[PDB]
From TrEMBL, chain A:
Belongs to the eukaryotic ribosomal protein eL18 family. GO terms for biological process: translation. This is Large ribosomal subunit protein uL15/eL18 domain-containing protein. Residues 1-187 form the Large ribosomal subunit protein uL15/eL18 domain. The keyword Cell cycle does not apply. Mg(2+) binds at N7. It is found in: Rough endoplasmic reticulum. Residues 160-170 have a biased composition (Basic residues). The lineage of its organism: Eukaryota, Metazoa, Chordata, Craniata, Vertebrata. InterPro entries: Ribosomal_eL18 (IPR000039), Ribosomal_eL18/eL18-A/B/_CS (IPR021132), Ribosomal_uL15/eL18 (IPR021131), Ribosomal_uL15/eL18_sf (IPR036227). Residues 151-187 are annotated as: Disordered. One of its GO terms (cellular component) is cytosolic large ribosomal subunit.
Length: 187, 175, 168, 75, 159
RNA sequence: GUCUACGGCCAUACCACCCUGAACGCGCCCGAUCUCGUCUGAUCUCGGAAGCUAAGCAGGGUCGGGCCUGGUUAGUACUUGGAUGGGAGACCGCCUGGGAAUACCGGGUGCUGUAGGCUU
RNA sequence: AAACCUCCCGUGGAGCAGAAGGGCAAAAGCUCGCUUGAUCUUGAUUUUCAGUACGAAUACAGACCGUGAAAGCGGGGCCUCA
RNA sequence: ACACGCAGUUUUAUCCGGUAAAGCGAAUGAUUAGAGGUCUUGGGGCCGAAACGAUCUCAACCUAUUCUCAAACUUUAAAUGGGUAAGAAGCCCGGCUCGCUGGCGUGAGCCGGGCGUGGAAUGGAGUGCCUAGUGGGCCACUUUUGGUAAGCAGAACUGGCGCUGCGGGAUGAACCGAACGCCGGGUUAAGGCGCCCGAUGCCGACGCUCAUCAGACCCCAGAAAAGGUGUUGGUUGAUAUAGAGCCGAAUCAACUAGCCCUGAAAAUGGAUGGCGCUGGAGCGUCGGGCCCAUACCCGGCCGUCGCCGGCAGUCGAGAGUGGAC
């Protein structure tokens, strides 16, 4: 006879990756041991990000990684990205880097190796710095997907700039009553 | 308000001091209640009814039980009552014969409940006074004022009926 | 006359269940850590505490606990909240680890801080898990009415010790 | 075949099931709903804040030197 | 069903009190308001332009915009599912300064004074407010005169 | 002590009658050429300083009306919460907290900001 | 008893178009003199709200104006419906 | 060994209201009755040719009173309740920008520096998407609309049934207690303890009650006004040895409150649940003792949630060092 609301007693956070691939599970075991032994929170963050789904770890662009490493203070530090590193074609000068990532695109890998940089996997990063010392943790833009453009306040509402679900943009598919001031109203 | 074997309590209390009135007067009451908590509650009720004083706006300086001065002496207690019936309220004066004032008050409560179906919350006691053999108006208590008292126990209805339930001898009621 | 000081702390026990409870009464009961029936908790007395107890007066029976009552409650049914877990106070190490920053290192220090309300009474009482008292042996007078009118609810300052003896 | 017209019996319980909250207060609130002349003046001030940056930097350096002298005198 | 009129049910709200009709006092006109000022809204029947809605009467909000002779104020309004902070434009006569924040500001100044003081002395002073404590047990002196006995008054039919 | 100009709070300031105002000041008051507007210099405007506290105004008084603030009304009416309380009901009583308003009886009859005068 | 003129009292007990409520006394009423802010154009907000429209309304801003000596007021009707 | 924020809560200060209540000797409307008024006029009348000359009267009005009212009245005016503030997103300085505003000044925005537990108690919080079913409700304390009333229709807060089992009310939607994993022991709530049926098989306490229609426990299943010297208490008022011819000590009257009775009549035979109960097994105030539900305490087992959970193979229990040289 106790009044406790069991509505949110079960936490929905992930515990193991849903992927059935074996290399990711081996990395999960390694970082589980590292997080439960070492006092560093870097291992815990890396394990949590490894648990995340594909959409929750967007790819990181080479230009974004370059601009994040160019910040003063993180000189000679290894970049740790749980997603994938993708080449950026609109950048010419690429300094040498120390990048740790699950995957790297072929073009980005060629660019980094030609620039004189070094690319490491997560097991190599664990062997080098078990507690993640001298590491810069980076991630891609979470809201970069076009899916989030359709989220938020619904269209046809004042002060809303949400992209509606339209079969094909055009003159006679929208921008009519509800959007034109000359036809009914607008928001 | 419930009732049991009631006890008399002297309760002195006063409203909390104020900048305008540094020394408020103290008020004393005699409350017949089973315990000190209900005694203080009844004291606050009567004080609120009589004067402009509330429990939050006042404090009980001292609540203490009053013991009977002559427990071994038989006395006549006259009690003035003001109770609420189904109709409008009425005033009554009753007389009882007992050894203690608290016992007399308890007997008065029981008699009121038995004869008028009056509840303790509806019963308000004003004054209980010990009186001599004279000044008694109730024949029920006057009949016991006799030096050479003499009466038998005519029909001695036996008890222990469920002590051995089946017996050869029928019981006896004359002794 | 000598008017004794108003007690600094009081013991409150929920006497009725969770079925058919007003929203405000339920909110105050769950703020006083009184969720299950027959649960006791020490609450220090002030204006706000007295007003809350007045609000949940029909649903609780409360009074002024005695030193023996505090000793028995802390010893026999004393549980501490460590890592959000109810753990029995079987040794002073748990109390030292939890309330070491407050000068409380043993059951005696905890009892002293609970009884003589000090600076860290809040921390001591929050560390103390609410006491899951058993049903009152010998029965009750009346659950649904106030103590003054023959019931058990309300303020029973001194008789709360008898209630603790019958329940603990 | 008449039906019930209007009632709000369970509405409070429905509202409080999710625990209705006060609006999220955030610092640096929006400037929507401010008079256009004031908005223009604030925009001009923000645009021209870059003017006289060296004067502010020199004044800050002088203040830092004064604070250093004061703390050296204190110690 | 009821009508959705703007001034429906405001027979007594938007009405001046007794013997206070006529010309509006000029102190309300000549008192200033800044941004972020806590202000309680009270409609006035004399002035109709810029009159706030009946739902905002008595509600208190902060000022975010100040026009020539009106104030933009954000107030919290609860509508059946949630509380929304919405901005309304209210003329000067329907607006008053709130002293609730001033009471807190005075205490803040006192705390600053009492922290500047008693710091070189080393004696830590209690800054936090405290609820009503026990009544600090004391003695009551019954100097000579005994407490007055109170006898309940017997009932008598008056009416 | 007090007056004028501009005010703040808008009767403790209002209303009726009676008494007193030394000086400045506020006004009554004398005329219509000029400025001004009316049927009428009645109002307003203008040009004045022979008379006056007659009036306005200021101060005081009325066992004054009113107004403001207190006691009484009254812990009364009412009211949050409670009961397997009473009653056929109408309604009422009790516990727990808050707490009114008439009649009736007392006190008072404007404070104050800026600038400029008189009693030097 | 009710035509016109004069004096006094007169808190509004009249009037403000309408139904009612609120509001107003050197006005928001009556009479005068000038006028068409009942003009044009972006936005923001309020009332039923789902916080969507329509209708109505509120503070602004950018131009042309009206009036008054000026402060100011006015982008329809003193406000709540048309 | 190291906490920011949030809340059907309260407290401290600040505002909001016009409902209960109260008033109409205060505004509006209704309304009774007397005193002073040719106030003012007018009708019937009588003494008068008439006359405000005397006499009242009825008509609307006044001057001080008086009786009763208002959901669409109010000078007043609660209880409950509704917004706020209780600090780092705050204060104190120094300097810049402004096509805005101004005599100097404001006001806003920019940068640099100094100051931390800001009332009580409890909680870990915030955020984004896919989203089934529902859009016939009903009952109960309190307030309240129409109706004579309705197990009627329609509203406000809260709680229930719906979606809910369990103990009690014999029976049972909504009542009281109390909410559910499978068990052992103990104790209770609401209710009860003559038998059905677990427990008063107490040497229970004090009083009332005779019914040829007794009475027997919230919702609830049934009664009214008026009466009774039937009986048990209370209030008030008189007279009685100066006697209420004889007997001889207490007596009479008006109210009022308890139990019982008349009032009290429906149809298959009939229901305090039945038997039955009257030194109660009825009624009112109450004592101990006892009986027990899936309710509370201890323990065993199953599953769910949480542990910034532990174990890849190591020292170590308020941990507050180890090890060269």
């Amino acid at each position: 006879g106790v009044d406790i609301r069991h509505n949110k007693d079960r936490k929905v956070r992930r515990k193991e990756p849903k992927s059935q691939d074996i290399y990711l599970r081996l990395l999960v075991k390694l970082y589980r041991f590292l997080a439960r032994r070492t006092n560093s929170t870097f291992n815990q963050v890396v394990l949590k990000r490894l648990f995340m789904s594909r959409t929750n770890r967007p790819p990181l662009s080479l230009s974004r990684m370059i601009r994040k490493m160019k910040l003063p203070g993180r000189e000679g530090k290894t970049a740790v990205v749980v997603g994938t590193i993708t080449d950026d074609v609109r950048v010419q000068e690429v300094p040498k880097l120390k990048v740790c990532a699950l995957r790297v695109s072929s073009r980005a890998r060629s660019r980094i190796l030609k620039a004189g940089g070094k690319i490491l996997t997560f097991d190599q990063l664990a062997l080098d710095s078990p507690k993640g010392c001298g590491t810069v943790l980076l991630s891609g833009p979470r809201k970069g997907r076009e899916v989030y453009r359709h989220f938020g306040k619904a269209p046809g509402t004042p002060h809303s700039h949400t992209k509606p679900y339209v079969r094909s943009k055009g003159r006679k598919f929208e921008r009519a009553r509800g959007r034109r001031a000359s036809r009914g109203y607008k928001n | 308000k419930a009732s049991g074997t009631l006890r008399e309590y002297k309760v002195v209390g006063r409203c909390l001091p104020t900048p305008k009135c540094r020394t408020p007067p103290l008020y004393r009451m005699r409350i017949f209640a089973p315990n000190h908590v209900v005694a203080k509650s009844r004291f606050w009720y009567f004080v609120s009814q009589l004067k402009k004083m509330k429990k939050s706006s006042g404090e009980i300086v001292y609540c203490g039980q009053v013991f009977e001065k002559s427990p071994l002496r038989v006395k006549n207690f006259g009690i003035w009552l003001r109770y609420d019936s189904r109709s409008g309220t009425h005033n009554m004066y009753r007389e009882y014969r007992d050894l203690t004032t608290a016992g007399a008050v308890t007997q008065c409560y029981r008699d009121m409940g038995a004869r008028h179906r009056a509840r303790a919350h509806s019963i308000q006691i004003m004054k209980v006074e010990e009186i001599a053999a004279s000044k008694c108006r109730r024949p029920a208590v006057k009949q016991f004022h006799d030096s050479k008292i003499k009466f038998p126990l005519p029909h001695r209805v036996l008890r222990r009926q469920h002590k051995p339930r089946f017996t050869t001898k029928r019981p006896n009621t004359f002794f | 006359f000598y008017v004794p000081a108003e007690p600094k702390l009081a013991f409150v026990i929920r006497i009725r269940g969770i079925n058919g409870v007003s929203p405000k009464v339920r909110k105050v009961l769950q703020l006083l850590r009184l969720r299950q029936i027959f649960n006791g908790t020490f609450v220090k007395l002030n204006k706000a505490s007295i007003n809350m107890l007045r609000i949940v007066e029909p649903y609780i029976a409360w009074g002024y606990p005695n030193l023996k009552s505090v000793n028995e409650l802390i010893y026999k049914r004393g549980y501490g909240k460590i890592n959000k877990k109810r753990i029995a106070l079987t040794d002073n190490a748990l109390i030292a680890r939890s309330l070491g920053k407050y000068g409380i290192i043993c059951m005696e220090d905890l009892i002293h801080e609970i009884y003589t309300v000090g600076k860290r009474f809040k921390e001591a009482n929050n560390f103390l898990w609410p006491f899951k008292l058993s049903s009152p042996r010998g029965g009750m007078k009346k659950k649904t009415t106030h103590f003054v009118e023959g019931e058990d609810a309300g303020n029973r300052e001194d008789q709360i010790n008898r209630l603790i003896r019958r329940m603990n | 075949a008449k039906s019930k017209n209007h009632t709000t019996h369970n509405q409070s319980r429905k509202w409080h099931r999710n625990g209705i909250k006060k609006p999220r207060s955030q610092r640096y609130e929006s400037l929507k709903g401010v008079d256009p002349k004031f908005l223009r003046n604030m925009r001009f001030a923000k645009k021209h804040n870059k003017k006289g940056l060296k004067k502010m930097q020199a004044n800050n350096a002088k203040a830092m030197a004064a604070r250093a002298e004061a703390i050296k005198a204190l110690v | 069903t009821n009508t959705k009129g703007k001034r429906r049910g405001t027979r007594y709200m938007f009405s001046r009190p007794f013997r206070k009709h006529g010309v509006v006092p000029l102190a309300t006109y000549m008192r200033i308001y800044k941004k972020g000022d806590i202000v309680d809204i009270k409609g006035m029947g004399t002035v109709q332009k810029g009159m706030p809605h009946k739902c905002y009467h008595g509600k208190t909000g902060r000022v975010y915009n100040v026009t020539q002779h009106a104030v933009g104020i954000v107030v919290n309004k609860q509508v059946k599912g949630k509380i929304l902070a919405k901005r309304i434009n209210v003329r000067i006569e329907h607006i008053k300064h709130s002293k609730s924040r001033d009471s807190f500001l005075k205490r803040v100044k006192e705390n600053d004074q009492k922290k500047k003081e008693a710091k070189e002395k080393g004696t830590w002073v209690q800054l936090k407010r405290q609820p009503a404590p026990p009544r600090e047990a004391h003695f009551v002196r019954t100097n000579g005169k005994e407490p007055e006995l109170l006898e309940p008054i017997p009932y008598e039919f008056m009416a």
